[PDB]
Structures are given as C-alpha cells and as structure tokens.
Amino acid sequence: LIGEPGVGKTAIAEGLAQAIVNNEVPETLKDKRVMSLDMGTVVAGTKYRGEFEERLKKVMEEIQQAGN
Amino acid sequence: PSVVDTVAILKGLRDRYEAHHRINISDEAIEAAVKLSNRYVSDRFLPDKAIDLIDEASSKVRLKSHTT
Ligand SMILES: [Mg+2]
C-alpha cells in the first residue's frame, strides 16, 4: 500500500482483517491469519552471528507449514 | 526476451495459470498483455510484467465471477 502519510494504509490492512473476521472475502482466504510483524522485534537481541537469519528462517518455515 | 518470445513464454505458462485461476486464457489476451505491458509499463521487464498483467486480470475476473 503506497500513499501519503495519514491516508489509511494501516486502516486498509485492519479492514482486511475485519473482513476476514466478518467473512466477506473469497473462499481462498476464509480462515487466514493476518499477523503483523515488526522488523525491530525480529532484530531485537541478535548480537551473535547467524541469530537473525535463524529467527527469520524459523518464521518462514512456520509460515510454510501453517499455510494460512 | 522479445515480444514473440514473451508470447511463447505466456502460452507455455498458460496451463499453470488456468489451473490456479480456474479460467481459460485466450491467445488474444496473451498478445494484448504483451503489447500493453511493453508499451505502457516502463519500470519492469517484458516477461515478468506480462505474467503479472495476465495473473492479475485472471484474479480480477475470478473474483468478480466467484463473489456472491
Ligand atoms: Mg501505518
């Protein structure tokens, strides 16, 4: 979502989540989880080498396994 | 790739996208997608943007037909 500051992009994402909850989306997205990831949280506490890559890889593997 | 090569690529990849989008993609659609993406889209390169145009058109028509 591209736009000027304060136009409602985060509101667009929240509205998509609300549409998922209210179930007005196609069948392919009926029971999908919209999970908001902050990269500062992912990079937190990552002093040693390979820790950030490990965390991101585990996140991606979990996404692939869940599939929703 | 050139325009003719891009059309050949789209015709080769048509079966996968028809299977995913549950629709039928016409040859005139392939030609129009290649021509319009080459003429109007400027920041991207022929095969990728032609594929994107075909895929998004298929998604839009699928969403319009499915919604009820
Ligand atoms: Mg925001």
Q: Which residues of B38-53 are buried (b: 16+ CB within 10 A; e: fewer)?
A: beeeeeeebbebbbeb
In whole angstroms, how far apart are CA B55 and each of A59, A64, B51, B52? 28, 22, 6, 5
Please state the separation of Cα A50 from the chain's center in Å.
Answer: 22
Q: Exposure of B54 by Cβ count < 10 A (0-12 exposed, 13-18 middle, 19+ buried)?
A: buried
CB B48, CB B1: distance < 8 Å: no
Please name which of B16, A1, B3 lies closest in space to residue B50, comparing C-alpha atoms. Answer: B3
Please state the separation of Cα B41 from the chain's center in Å.
Answer: 14
Q: Does B68 touch chain A (CB under 8 A)?
A: no
Largest alpha-carbon pair distance within chain A?
45
Residue written as token pair 């991101």: A56
Q: Please give the distance, rounded to the nearest whole angstrom, from the Cα atom of residue B9 to the centre of ligand 1.
A: 39
Query: What's the angle, vertex CA B54, arms to CA B49 and CA B57, rounded to 5?
Result: 120
**Residue A6, phi-psi category: left (phi > 0), alpha (psi -120 to 50), beta (remainder):** left
The method of structure determination was cryo-EM
- Distance CA(A30)–CA(B29), nearest Å, equals 30
Chain B 2-61, residues with CB within 8 Å of chain A CB atoms: none
Residues 6+ apart with CB under 8 A from A53: none
Q: The tokens of B58 are what?
A: 């298929």
Q: Does A27 touch chain B (CB under 8 A)?
A: yes
The kind and range of the H/E element at A23 are none
In whole angstroms, how far apart are CA B31 and each of A16, B39, B40? 34, 12, 14
